[PDB]
Amino acid sequence: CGVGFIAAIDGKPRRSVVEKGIEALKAVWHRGAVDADGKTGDGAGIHVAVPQKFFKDHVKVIGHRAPDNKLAVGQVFLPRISLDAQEACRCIVETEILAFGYYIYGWRQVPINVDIIGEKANATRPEIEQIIVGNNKGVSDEQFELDLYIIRRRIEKAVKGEQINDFYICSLSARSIIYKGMFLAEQLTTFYPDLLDERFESDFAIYHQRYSTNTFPTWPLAQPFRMLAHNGEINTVKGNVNWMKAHETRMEHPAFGTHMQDLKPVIGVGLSDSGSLDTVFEVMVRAGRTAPMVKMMLVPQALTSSQTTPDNHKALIQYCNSVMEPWDGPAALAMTDGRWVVGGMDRNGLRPMRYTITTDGLIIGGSETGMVKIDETQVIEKGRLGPGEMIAVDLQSGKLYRDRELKDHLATLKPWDKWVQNTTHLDELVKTASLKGEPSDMDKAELRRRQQAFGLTMEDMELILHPMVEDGKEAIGSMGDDSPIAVLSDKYRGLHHFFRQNFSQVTNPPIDSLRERRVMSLKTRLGNLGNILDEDETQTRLLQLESPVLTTAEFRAMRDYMGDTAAEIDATFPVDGGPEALRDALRRIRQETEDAVRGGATHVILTDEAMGPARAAIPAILATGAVHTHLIRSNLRTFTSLNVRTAEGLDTHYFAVLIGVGATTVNAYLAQEAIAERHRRGLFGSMPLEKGMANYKKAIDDGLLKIMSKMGISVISSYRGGGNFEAIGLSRALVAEHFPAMVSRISGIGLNGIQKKVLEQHATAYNEEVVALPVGGFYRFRKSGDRHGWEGGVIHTLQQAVTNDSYTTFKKYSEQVNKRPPMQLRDLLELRSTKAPVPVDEVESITAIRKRFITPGMSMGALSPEAHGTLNVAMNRIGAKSDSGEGGEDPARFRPDKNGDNWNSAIKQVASGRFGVTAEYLNQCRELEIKVAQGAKPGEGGQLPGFKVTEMIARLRHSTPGVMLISPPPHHDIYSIEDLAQLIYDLKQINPDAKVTVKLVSRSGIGTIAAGVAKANADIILISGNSGGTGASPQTSIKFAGLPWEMGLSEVHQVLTLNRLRHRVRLRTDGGLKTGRDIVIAAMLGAEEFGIGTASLIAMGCIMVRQCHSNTCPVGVCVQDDKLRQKFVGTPEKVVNLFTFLAEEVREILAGLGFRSLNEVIGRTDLLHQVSRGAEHLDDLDLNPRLAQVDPGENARYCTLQGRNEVPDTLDARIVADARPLFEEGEKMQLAYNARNTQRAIGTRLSSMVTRKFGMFGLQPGHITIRLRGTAGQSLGAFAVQGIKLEVMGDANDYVGKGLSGGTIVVRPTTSSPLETNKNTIIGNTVLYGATAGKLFAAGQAGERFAVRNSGATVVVEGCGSNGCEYMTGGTAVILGRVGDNFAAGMTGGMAYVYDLDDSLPLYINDESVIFQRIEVGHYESQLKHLIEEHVTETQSRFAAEILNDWAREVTKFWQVVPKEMLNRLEVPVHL
Amino acid sequence: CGVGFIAAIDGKPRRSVVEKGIEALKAVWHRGAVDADGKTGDGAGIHVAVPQKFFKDHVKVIGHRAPDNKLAVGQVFLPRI
Ligand SMILES: Cc1cc2nc3c(=O)[nH]c(=O)nc-3n(C[C@H](O)[C@H](O)[C@H](O)COP(=O)(O)O)c2cc1C
């Protein structure tokens, strides 16, 4: 896994670049997916210049004459199984090339060697050939390239016309060639011996290797591509393709001519994201622009409102963002035009990219800084690439442009500043809009009648509407969702309940938003779409709004500006139309919209304003979906906009789905009317109405940003009309016809059910004489309201059965719970065998079945210490496993109590915050667990209120007492599957006895992610559902996010069985498990272990009060008081009895079924049947996708291996064989070795042995020291304890000092280095992630996210990048250099010192929660002096030495940064 | 290698024709391409009438109502990978 590029600065061809490229490719085997075969790869490739002399000598040998001009060589993949396909494709190519007039020299068969390819990469091997085309018309180079591209496109279209499969073209150009395949990285020069020749010289080279998630290789899917190479993985392609489908219908350029007609469907079928992006990039380059300009137009920079860039770049970025929608997502790009060679990064800067210049006029860049062997007596400058940066090389003139120079050179071509001034805003327009013409308020009775028509209850106004207008933020709930799903319910559930949101597992990182809110934009532009292949002032003349949500006054001002060009459309249908009225209304509106747009209209306003006692309202979602889809399919969406006036919009989940369907702006007038009516009654107090509306809009925008950030999208323009949702319970026909791209794995109600529901509610509201709204139960149980999973009687009967220790009571409980109408997916299936029953005394005993149950993790921040300890003691008494969850654990509980009641936990979590993760915390467990996403709040981090953090929890988490703690949504360690494999390797090295468990959340597409994580040596997968509890979460994320585990579990099982991977991992599920029938169904689906969770809380005393976030739980389960902790009533015997009953129920059901063990039934799906609710409901749910049986064949249907999956040994092994006196005598040692980038986690296993022997703080500092010489790998010294000292001479790659636990690391350049130590990058990204103790001294600059989540470490580094010291909690950090934007963002504890020569810190710092001043206390001066002296002592630096020389005049050049919460608690105050 | 057809002259359904068809198919192994594997064939097939009662009982078991008219059953090959 990795990209890389080598370029000769002067621009002269030579063999050196090609041989160095091959050498660099030969050393990326550690990141790839190692396999037991050793021959099976997943894709590799190189992209070089054309060796003219080679092919000219070939042609001479054949017998022709070598031409004067350059040659053209096309590489093709033809089918191999047939002999007509080959002949048909050859004929097509030859009649399509000769139609232009060029001369064909002949074909050539590339020599290959099939000795190195495995099996499954050989059954689909294509026939590789080359065609030699010469130019005889004497045309120029640009024209020749243009005709070659047109010929390639026409050949592709013609071959696709005959549906001729297995055909591909890897290149057809006169400048460059591509050698790629499905072999290992190191075996590239063995499969293709041509590259071993002496005449293959070039002036540039690009190389790439990928890491696929599945095990079925397809040769045309290997990178690099033609004029592109991509690392990372793009988020928004389902939205960008839809917008390209509208951009195609107007684009045209005189360079192509009539031939333009054969490039209309630019994005073909059967491509990945890196293919579609490549196609768009190539089209935009071939039409006049240059590679830097296209890179800026497609992947722009983050336009911030700060004074740290010249206005030139701001105008340029405004133009670029106005002309095109960005292509977001983690992306490290290495692209090349015919002239330029560019290496660039995305907006957030997630992937790493490091480069190097040598004195030979040679630049080498890649993902790792130790791939090519180069002595430091040859280097000139080392560097990196920040967020949005780029580095370019011009080969025609032979020059090297860095970031700023390239920006200044690019902002000169056109007068951008004079062009941008054509933009017009709306606040100017709303201020010129006079305070006249406002209509009179609606009547109270009319408002209530309209609200009742949509099903709005008073709890929708007192719970989720009052906090918005009162506070500026959204509501909060603290328990799982036990409500029935939308289709199985019986009340009126709006259409916006059928759409579950999306999020990102390991393959993509979610974007945190409370700290990097500067890179997220909500800009909206009307009058924007047009020709994308143009450059003129008319392209930036449009209307611009600051937010897609508009109030009523703003809507009237915008309607003023629109005026005489807009067309309004009715969206109501007659109630008496008949059984097919809604379909006819849809037809009518989607015909009128098209007939009006063709008439010159440019704005369509879709209103339901005429809703009355005889006209029901069409659901706005369906209307906008139909209209947008029809406009896209009729080549008219490019002309107009789409404005929606709705009467149901009240929650932040409505606007999200409306903008996701395709609407441009959304206006909710009924909500504003309700706000005004509630204000006139004197309910908000003394605040004006405008302040309330402003607070409501701010809360809506914040919630929209939250919803947009769960997936990884940072701009609204690329999120609109993409359909980032899933419909569960809608007909396949309806979704596939009216909605762009959503999957309905189980079809549901069609149009008749929606019409029936709408008409029923409308009649109930308008013919029935209403006087007030129902109280309604959706978040809280109400008798008049909706049904729930946990009612009162069930809980009381369960608690009684548990406390009296009687089984018949528990069977009464089971009979009560297994008799309600269906409420979940697992209620419709039915067990049915064909064998004869066997007696009860023959099945497995209760012990072997109880050891299959575990309890999920529940943090100590949420639960009380007593309940946590009770669970830990109870679960260890019966032999099962418990969980500690996030928030760490008490060290003093690490030994059995004196009743033998051991309070330890057999499962430790590695949360996203690493709040208590140390070296001892990971060596005191049997079985580990990685938590990627939680069941209740997927794509989000756990929260903890500011008053829940007592002194004990503050000490246990190494934080500040009385401070809100919100975990970061992403992981900062897991940005792609390769980083997940790296982290799994780290965890398996730090603890040599435990297993690694990955926790996911059920959704569509989880199958490929599961097949990918299974290749990363993970051995337990956990699939949580959407109905899981939580400690504190927003209500929208609780009710409108996730999917039932019935889908995800079956999908993962089938996908894992398909890839012959099921026999290596185990499956575990939880979420909503209550009885034995549920467990048996889950075991039939494929699971092997089961988690219970909330039921345990009910066995200990919790009665579902749903006030966990208030710190006032009456029983005292989730509490941190003393008054309330004294009211605990829990006992372990209760939980033991619960588990015993639950296991013996499974025994009962199995004995009645006809089996004697759970292994007899796991995976046997054919024991389940589906019966529907009857001929009176007519939901067409087909669970057959859920009951499909994939045949294993040879393998079993469960795990059959012993122990974990061991991994290859790093250098640590040798160290353990050398430092034996330290482990036997306990004496001092000193070792020296040679490091290389193919050695990961150097010094971690040694730390494990030291921890097991002496402990974290048993050895004096510097007991054992190691000296490494060379560029080290990743995770250097991760989880190092005190007493270990690593000294690297050279540089480190990434994640150096991750989770430092008291050790000491020192990084310095070589003594023979001609480099300024304060101007060259030495360490990479994410340094000191979650460290608790130790020291780290570096003699260079660090990367991005330097010292995130630092807790107790001390670091001295000569520079920093962007996002430095983000969300730091404790310790000291000295930065002797410059910093980037968003510095010290979210900092809540510690201290920082910056050394400012430029006096430009107030422009980069985030003055939100920290204060910056100058040093005024000698106590804080001795600290800095001693730290810099220690730095000088260790690294022998020269910058810091010269700073120490002139101390009196440089002490006044330092800024001191101190958090705001630490203003009372500091002990020597900072002021005078 | 071979074709074959069985028909009831009067035109009344019965299990006899289907079982005789299966029996006839079970005895054409001498003309085919025998292989060292013993499992690899090159194609075989049968074409019969629709068993209305079978699928009607299936639908009844599912939970719907068996219609009065005849049924329609489509057999499809979808991708597996
Ligand atoms: C009070 C509470 C605290 C929780 N804390 C965590 C946590 O810290 N980390 C985590 O991964 N899951 C946490 N969970 C979710 C559980 O791990 C598990 O997914 C959930 O309880 C399953 O729901 P169920 O009991 O209905 O089966 C918590 C759940 C609750 C109710």
Ligand code: F3S
């Ligand atoms: S709902 Fe929560 S506040 Fe206590 S009683 Fe149950 S754990």
